[PDB]
Amino acid sequence: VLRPLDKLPGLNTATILLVGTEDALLQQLADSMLKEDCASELKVHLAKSLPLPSSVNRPRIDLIVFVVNLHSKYSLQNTEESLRHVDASFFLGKVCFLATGAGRESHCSIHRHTVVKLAHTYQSPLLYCDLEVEGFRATMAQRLVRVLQICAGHVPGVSALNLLSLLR
Amino acid sequence: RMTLLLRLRAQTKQQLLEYKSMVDASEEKKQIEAKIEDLENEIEEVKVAFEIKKLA
Amino acid sequence: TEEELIRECEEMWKDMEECQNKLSLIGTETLTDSN
């Protein structure tokens, strides 16, 4: 079970952990999220399911974006299954719900209300995008990285706790 | 470096801010229509508590 | 300068090390199913 403050922070390290069943798209999103030379260390983490095999030395994880591939109902059954292994103090600010495949709206095995209901019943931001195309990735990557500096505390005015008060 | 140590001070005065907020929330031990209302009256009252703080 | 700044900066490090050991003793890691 992941907790927000189980590890100590670094200096400029903002460790986000992507969550999605498909992993090539997660790798593409991670590549785009490090393409821009931002002012923060960006030890991006990938995964498939929140059990997250127990390996110590994992840094203080500052964001978990649940990439829910709307094209595949698996990406929700593997998110909702993985949503039960997140600490309740982790769901406040440091949780986003990416919904890739939205907008195509013809491959969607999942009605975007269902991801809306999931991201509202867990009280966390829900950021639509279409991760397959770099044009909508290289702008969602700069949205996840500015949410990153909010949850990791790099912007010295806004906490992760202040964040969800903005994205309600 | 000093700018980098300044980015650290700042980042840590907010990471300890988060740490103290969480440990105070852990120190403590309903009307959903108003549960967001006594959620809103801080997000306005912490807001006046820290916009004046940032303004000082 | 950095001598004086890292004075409380690492003192803030000690405070997170206590508040984390405080957070590592509550250790509830409480789960959240639907509802």
Binding site: G10, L11 | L4, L8 | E2, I6, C9, E10, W13
Partner: peptide, 13 residues
């Protein structure tokens, strides 16, 4: 203090 970079950069290795 601060394993961070003030150690890691100085002990660059």
């Amino acid at each position: 203090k601060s394993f961070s970079t003030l150690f890691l950069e100085t002990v660059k290795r």
